[PDB]
């Protein structure tokens, strides 16, 4: 199997878990759950959502 990464939060996606979304510009996004999927549809920036891997990488948290 392959373990994919969340396109919004960077969480690990196990097989059969979450959803996938193909945008009209032929780019693939993978969501681990409806929470990150709905935040993506609400167009929030993952750099400003405090629990995401990209936020913690930006803010040097836990280093």
């Amino acid at each position: 199997m392959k373990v994919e990464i969340d396109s919004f939060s960077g969480a690990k996606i196990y097989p059969g878990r979450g959803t996938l979304f193909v945008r009209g510009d032929s780019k693939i996004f993978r969501f681990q759950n409806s929470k990150s999927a709905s935040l993506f549809k609400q167009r929030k920036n993952p750099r400003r959502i405090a629990w995401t891997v990209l936020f913690r990488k930006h803010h040097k948290k836990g280093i």
Partner: protein
């Protein structure tokens, strides 16, 4: 020979097969006649690999191949990649491509020396083609057809292009590729010639509905005699 073959009724052989000088690729869900054509014509000198690309029977439109290298999309699984690595000779290089257009047989029309690509490919993918295939690359369209792999059939000796192609585009592409090109049809008038047939230096395989003048044009332009 332009060999008459069907894929279970399908007269498009370039969709389900990829033929180069060094290897051949065929789909796993194929008939005995379809395998027997490649087995008899190619012989034991050239390996024939039954493969699946990205879980799809279509392999010719998904992959772009060369005698030096093979390009596969990102969606190709590790089991398929390892099976191709074992089955293929050590000379060829297999490298995954991470690119949005992702259907390399449609995107890329290539031979041993020179290649035509889709105009809008990424620069990293162009450099990856030039590295792995060792092939000089041009971004060009065949009379406004961006899918140069589907709308051109190319080999070392010559090339077949789309029938509704401007003549000025024909000498421009011929001078750019350093091979003679003929506008013609395959499979009783189907426009998609690259999807219609596969060709290499000594063999061309086409659909059963490809007529005799079309087959004569094929053997004339590809010098298979």
């Amino acid at each position: 020979m332009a060999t008459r073959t069907q894929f279970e009724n399908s007269n498009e052989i370039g969709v389900f097969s990829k033929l180069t000088n060094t290897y051949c690729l065929v789909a796993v869900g194929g008939s005995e006649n379809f395998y027997s054509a490649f087995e008899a014509e190619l012989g034991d000198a050239i390996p024939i690999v039954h493969t699946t690309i990205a879980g799809t029977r279509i392999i010719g439109r998904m992959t772009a191949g060369n005698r030096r290298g093979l390009l596969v999309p990102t969606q190709t699984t590790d089991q398929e990649l390892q099976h191709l690595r074992n089955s293929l000779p050590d000379s060829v290089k297999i490298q995954r491509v991470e690119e949005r257009l992702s259907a390399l047989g449609n995107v890329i029309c290539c031979n041993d020396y020179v290649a035509l690509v889709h105009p809008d490919i990424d620069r990293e993918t162009e450099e990856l083609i030039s590295d792995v295939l060792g092939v000089e690359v041009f971004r060009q369209t065949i009379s406004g057809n961006i899918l140069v792999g589907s709308y051109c059939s190319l080999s070392n000796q010559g090339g077949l292009v789309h029938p509704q192609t401007s003549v000025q585009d024909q000498e421009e592409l011929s001078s750019l590729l350093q091979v003679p090109l003929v506008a013609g049809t395959v499979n009783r008038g189907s426009s998609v010639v690259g999807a219609g047939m596969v060709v290499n230096d000594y063999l061309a395989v086409t659909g059963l509905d490809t007529t005799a003048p079309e087959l004569s044009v094929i053997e004339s332009i590809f010098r298979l005699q």
